[PDB]
Amino acid sequence: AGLPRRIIKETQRLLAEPVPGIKAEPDESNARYFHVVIAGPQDSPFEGGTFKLELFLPEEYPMAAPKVRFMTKIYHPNVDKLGRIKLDILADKWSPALQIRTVLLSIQALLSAPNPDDPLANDVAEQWKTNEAQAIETARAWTRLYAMNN
Amino acid sequence: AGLPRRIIKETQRLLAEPVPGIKAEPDESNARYFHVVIAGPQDSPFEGGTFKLELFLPEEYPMAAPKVRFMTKIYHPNVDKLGRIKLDILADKWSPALQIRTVLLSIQALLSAPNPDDPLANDVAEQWKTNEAQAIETARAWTRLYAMNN
Amino acid sequence: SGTVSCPICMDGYSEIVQNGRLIVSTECGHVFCSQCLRDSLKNANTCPTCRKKINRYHPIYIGSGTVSCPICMDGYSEIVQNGRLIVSTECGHVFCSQCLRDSLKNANTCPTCRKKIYHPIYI
Amino acid sequence: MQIFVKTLTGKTITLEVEPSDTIENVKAKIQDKEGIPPDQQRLIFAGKQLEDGRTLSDYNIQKESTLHLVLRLRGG
Amino acid sequence: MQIFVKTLTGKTITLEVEPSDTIENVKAKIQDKEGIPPDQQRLIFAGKQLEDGRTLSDYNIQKESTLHLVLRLRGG
Ligand SMILES: [Zn+2]
Ligand SMILES: [Zn+2]
Ligand SMILES: [Zn+2]
Ligand SMILES: [Zn+2]
């Protein structure tokens, strides 16, 4: 009952070479379970926010994607109320050459470029389309409230 | 102002890691010109012989083969009176992935496995075919006479 | 084991890229700088290293020096250890043969570039 | 000037660039080294997915900065 | 037992062998590492061209010996 070699090396390297704005650390009692914090992108409504995520490496990793959820509430067309992320690299566009590090950088990318035309949170997206400036200021307020001092 | 890089490296390495039974040293006057001595193969009629050769790296080296000639007289179906070598890797079967070191090893191979069926020295090859044991003792005597103490 | 070079000019990875040349492979998995192989194939249509008739050939992307499989993360020695091969796709991306096999069970796009899609390379 | 790119594997490459290079121009250099077509590359900096038409200068990307590469992605 | 082969580039590889291995068996192991087919390999030791059918034992090739690889060649 030991981890694939991939998880061991990938984990050493992740910690060896941290990325600015991203913190990801395995749970001491569970090497498949990662505590994550990501900074909101700069020049986004999420800027200045610190967003908690969980990441889980399922049994078929890296042939299957990490399972990933927001734990910090966020206002975004492709994330729902329960913090689930609809994102093609976590499903059909996964590649085994992607890794924890680049999954997390892709989530940031997703915050910097939301896609309300193909949404997960229908109300959020409807706001985003029909009144983008307002949807943006809502994201900024939710960022202050939930994703600062947390 | 110089040699292709290939020739420089190749020359440093020859002199760095000598091959047993083969000595090849560039001339002070010309970095394309190599003084060579090869030992006769073991268990061949040439064994115990030391055979002088010259080797020249032409301008198109390594796209063309080194030019190579025996200076020591030798009794062999594929070497003539003037020490010229008929050998396919010096012509049609050259490869630029061959080198000085492997050209010279291939010449030793040729001494170890003569080919009298497709000869350069016709009368030598005729002896080799119709009376091989005698052709072999002639090669041994010519080895003593020309390729020892030389 | 370590750093790749071209058997014809004898330049290592650094010297190859230094002046615009690529690292290439033949179908038979033999590796050269682009220009040495271009110029051999003007002269004869046979692989310099193994003398196979070569018609096609392509760039491989290994930058740095010391090769490994991006999927399992084993380096050169660990891969061969267990009788896996180093393999390149037509788009020049390298994997161990087990990981590319397994990956193609699920996707049949290159894991590294997503081009729809190979052979051993000998380094 | 030099900037660094953390490629998919985690290895860092060094690119020679100008503040006026577009992100497209930077992708073309990465294609030469990595064999990944521009259409599949995304370049991440300060958490931002950089846009092809804009330049390094516009994003305040100065010498010695590190960009992070991921594969094309899409919210859904 | 181990022997060494100095391959075409000058690099040395290490092969795991038995005194009873034929030169053909040795060529097979070289093919795995080098991708050169047996029909194109020649193996040189003490100046001689080793024959496929014969074994390492027959040539007195002991552990830690080094064989030298060249391409197929022919006197003419
Ligand atoms: Zn070259
Ligand atoms: Zn080949
Ligand atoms: Zn692998
Ligand atoms: Zn590819």
UniProtKB/Swiss-Prot annotation, chains A, B:
Gene Ontology BP annotations: antiviral innate immune response; DNA double-strand break processing; double-strand break repair via homologous recombination; negative regulation of TORC1 signaling; positive regulation of canonical NF-kappaB signal transduction; positive regulation of DNA repair; positive regulation of double-strand break repair; positive regulation of intracellular signal transduction
Gene Ontology MF term list: ATP binding; RNA binding; ubiquitin binding; ubiquitin conjugating enzyme activity; ubiquitin protein ligase binding; ubiquitin-protein transferase activator activity; ubiquitin-protein transferase activity
Enzyme's top EC category: transferase
Superkingdom field: Eukaryota
Record's catalysed reaction(s): S-ubiquitinyl-[E1 ubiquitin-activating enzyme]-L-cysteine + [E2 ubiquitin-conjugating enzyme]-L-cysteine = [E1 ubiquitin-activating enzyme]-L-cysteine + S-ubiquitinyl-[E2 ubiquitin-conjugating enzyme]-L-cysteine
Effect recorded for residue 93 to R: No effect on ISGylation
Activity modulation: Activity is inhibited by binding to OTUB1, which prevents 'Lys-63'-linked polyubiquitination. Activity is inhibited by GPS2, leading to prevent 'Lys-63'-linked polyubiquitination.
SUPFAM superfamilies assigned: UBC-like
UniProt keyword terms in alphabetical order: Acetylation, ATP-binding, Cytoplasm, Disulfide bond, DNA damage, DNA repair, Isopeptide bond, Nucleotide-binding, Nucleus, Transferase, Ubl conjugation, Ubl conjugation pathway
Pathway terms, separated by semicolons: Protein modification; protein ubiquitination
Main localization (coarse): nucleus
Position of the Glycyl lysine isopeptide (Lys-Gly) (interchain with G-Cter in ISG15) cross-link: 91
Any one Gene Ontology cellular component term annotated for this protein: cytosol
InterPro entries: UBQ-conjugat_E2_core, UBQ-conjugating_AS, UBQ-conjugating_enzyme/RWD
Entry's EC annotation: 2.3.2.23
Active site: 86
Pfam families tied to this protein: UQ_con
PTM field: Conjugation to ISG15 impairs formation of the thioester bond with ubiquitin but not interaction with UBE2V2.
Modification N6-acetyllysine, positions: 81
Compartments (UniProt record): Nucleus; Cytoplasm
Protein name: Ubiquitin-conjugating enzyme E2 N
Species name: Homo sapiens
UniProtKB/Swiss-Prot annotation, chain C:
UniProt GO molecular function: DNA binding; identical protein binding; nuclear androgen receptor binding; nuclear estrogen receptor binding; nucleosome binding; SUMO polymer binding; TBP-class protein binding; ubiquitin conjugating enzyme binding
Zinc fingers typed RING-type, residue spans: 6-114
EC class of the enzyme, as a word: transferase
Record's catalysed reaction(s): S-ubiquitinyl-[E2 ubiquitin-conjugating enzyme]-L-cysteine + [acceptor protein]-L-lysine = [E2 ubiquitin-conjugating enzyme]-L-cysteine + N(6)-ubiquitinyl-[acceptor protein]-L-lysine
Expression across tissues: Widely expressed with highest levels in testis.
Gene Ontology terms describing biological process: cellular response to arsenic-containing substance; cellular response to cytokine stimulus; cellular response to gamma radiation; cellular response to hydroxyurea; cellular response to testosterone stimulus; male gonad development; negative regulation of protein localization to chromatin; positive regulation of DNA-templated transcription
Protein keywords: Activator, Cytoplasm, DNA-binding, Metal-binding, Nucleus, Phosphoprotein, Transcription, Transcription regulation, Transferase, Ubl conjugation, Ubl conjugation pathway, Zinc, Zinc-finger
EC number: 2.3.2.27
Listed pathway(s): Protein modification; protein ubiquitination
GO CC field: cytoplasm; nucleoplasm; nucleus; PML body
Annotated binding of Zn(2+) 2, by residue: 28, 30, 47, 50, 91, 93, 110, 113
Name of the featured protein: E3 ubiquitin-protein ligase RNF4
Species this protein is from: Rattus norvegicus
The organism's taxonomic lineage, starting at the top: Eukaryota, Metazoa, Chordata, Craniata, Vertebrata
Positions spanned in the full protein: 131 to 194 of 194
UniProtKB/Swiss-Prot annotation, chains D, E:
Domain Ubiquitin-like: start-end pairs: 1-76
Site (Essential for function): 68
Post-translational modification: Phosphorylated at Ser-65 by PINK1 during mitophagy. Phosphorylated ubiquitin specifically binds and activates parkin (PRKN), triggering mitophagy. Phosphorylation does not affect E1-mediated E2 charging of ubiquitin but affects discharging of E2 enzymes to form polyubiquitin chains. It also affects deubiquitination by deubiquitinase enzymes such as USP30.
Phosphoserine found at: 65
Membrane-topology annotation of the record: Peripheral membrane protein
Effect ascribed to mutating residue 9 to D: Impairs ubiquitination by CRL2(KLHDC3) E3 ligase complex
Record's function text: Exists either covalently attached to another protein, or free (unanchored). When covalently bound, it is conjugated to target proteins via an isopeptide bond either as a monomer (monoubiquitin), a polymer linked via different Lys residues of the ubiquitin (polyubiquitin chains) or a linear polymer linked via the initiator Met of the ubiquitin (linear polyubiquitin chains).
Effect of residue 7 to D: Impairs ubiquitination by CRL2(KLHDC3) E3 ligase complex
Residues bearing PTM (Microbial infection) ADP-ribosylthreonine: 66
Crosslink feature (Glycyl lysine isopeptide (Lys-Gly) (interchain with G-Cter in ubiquitin)) location: 6, 11, 27, 29, 33, 48, 63
UniProt effect for mutating residue 72 to K: No effect on ADP-ribosylation
Compartments, record wording: Cytoplasm; Nucleus; Mitochondrion outer membrane
Coverage span on the entire protein: 1 to 76 of 685
Protein name from the UniProt record: Ubiquitin
Lineage summary: Eukaryota, Metazoa, Chordata, Craniata, Vertebrata
Cross-link (Glycyl lysine isopeptide (Gly-Lys) (interchain with K-? in acceptor proteins)): 76
Annotated site residues (Interacts with activating enzyme) in this chain: 54, 72
UniProt-reported outcome of changing residue 68 to A: Decreases affinity for UBE2R2 in ECS(FEM1C)-UBE2R2 complex. Impairs ubiquitination by CRL2(KLHDC3) E3 ligase complex. Impairs ubiquitination by CRL2(KLHDC3) E3 ligase complex
